[PDB]
Design an enzyme around this catalytic site. Structure first.
Site, short mmCIF file in Angstrom:
data_model
loop_
_atom_site.label_atom_id
_atom_site.label_comp_id
_atom_site.label_asym_id
_atom_site.label_seq_id
_atom_site.Cartn_x
_atom_site.Cartn_y
_atom_site.Cartn_z
N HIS A 1 -13.57 5.59 -6.90
CA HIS A 1 -12.23 6.23 -6.53
C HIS A 1 -11.42 6.56 -8.74
O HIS A 1 -10.73 6.90 -8.60
CB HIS A 1 -11.20 5.49 -6.18
CG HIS A 1 -11.87 3.83 -6.19
ND1 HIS A 1 -12.88 3.31 -4.90
CD2 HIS A 1 -11.30 2.40 -7.14
CE1 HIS A 1 -12.53 2.15 -5.40
NE2 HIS A 1 -11.75 1.70 -6.69
N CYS B 1 -10.49 -2.78 -9.55
CA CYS B 1 -11.72 -2.60 -8.84
C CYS B 1 -12.73 -3.12 -10.21
O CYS B 1 -12.96 -4.12 -10.82
CB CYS B 1 -11.84 -1.70 -7.72
SG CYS B 1 -10.86 0.40 -8.14
#
Lengths: 181, 181
Positions: free
Chosen positions: B41, B148
């Site tokens: 991502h 993350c």
């Protein structure tokens, strides 16, 4: 560092909670009976969110020394039915210096997080957003806007509550045994 | 837990950096030569901020298995003059299970932070924002929107890269030795 971390994790699981006041989200440490501590900047109102539940506040004391100097802590007495596990035995009689410390944060934007900050020295007096503050402890901390309330710990010791920094050092109010009683 | 933490701190100081792409701020781990890894991502462009410096990107590979299944990792080759300290020896040949792990995050909103997440098990296949993803590892993680890129570690092992969660469990892409070469 590792023994400091193992101590902090157990301590936090037993004695910390996430708090929300109208002034933001903070890490809170319960101390004994119904008394917890927050950084002064949390400014608790008559009610708080503790772990997302409304709890009443019976009393809040902004701590100052014998000559009115700011200590940057707020002691609060919560209307709850449980007592906190007593940890006054882990608070020192005077400012602690240590070679390896860990700052622990428990908030919905920093859930159960731990930062090794290395050595802690007694800084004592400084200005903090222009306010003369005493009994500060200093350590390494590439710093933030708030994310304060953190609990400062080493193996077997609760040192203080993180109240701010300058970008390179972090500052905690020394959390002293005699504040409690 | 403590040995995991001491391992993670040393590893992060030696091999991690904070990265900014156009898609946000992430923890990056350098692996060997000029090759690092990010969650998929992060979507690195031809240039990134690494520890606040512009660094060129020579190649980015979105990893998939032998039948095109998403692995949710992006390997990137950086135009720098230093090599990374080789840590391929700390990557396993297959998915790791462990009793005590620590997730380490290094970003300007989470600077040097460490989360004990306890046990890691091999979850394998799941859907992640609707995308079929393989080789996932699962652990306890009262979860966030992003934050993350974290590195998942236990004593002597680099397990994976944190790619998301559900609110109660966190998920990491297994970081396997053979990805590198």
């Amino acid at each position: 560092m590792g023994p400091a971390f193992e101590f902090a994790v157990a301590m936090m699981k037993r004695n910390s909670s996430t708090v929300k006041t109208e002034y933001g989200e903070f890490t809170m440490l319960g101390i004994y009976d119904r008394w917890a501590v927050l950084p002064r900047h949390a400014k608790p109102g008559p009610t708080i969110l503790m772990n997302d539940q409304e709890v009443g506040v019976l009393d809040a004391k902004e701590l100052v020394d014998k000559d009115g100097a700011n200590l940057e802590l707020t002691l609060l007495k919560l209307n709850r039915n449980e007592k906190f596990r007593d940890i006054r035995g882990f608070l020192a009689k005077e400012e602690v210096e240590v070679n390896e410390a860990v700052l622990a944060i428990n908030t919905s934007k920093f859930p159960n997080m731990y930062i090794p900050v290395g050595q802690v020295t007694e800084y004592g007096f400084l200005y903090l957003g222009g306010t003369p503050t005493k009994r500060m402890l200093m350590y390494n901390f590439p710093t933030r806007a708030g994310q304060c309330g953190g609990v400062l710990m080493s193996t077997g010791k609760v040192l203080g509550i993180h109240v701010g920094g300058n970008g390179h050092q972090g500052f905690s109010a020394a959390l002293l045994k005699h504040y409690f009683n």
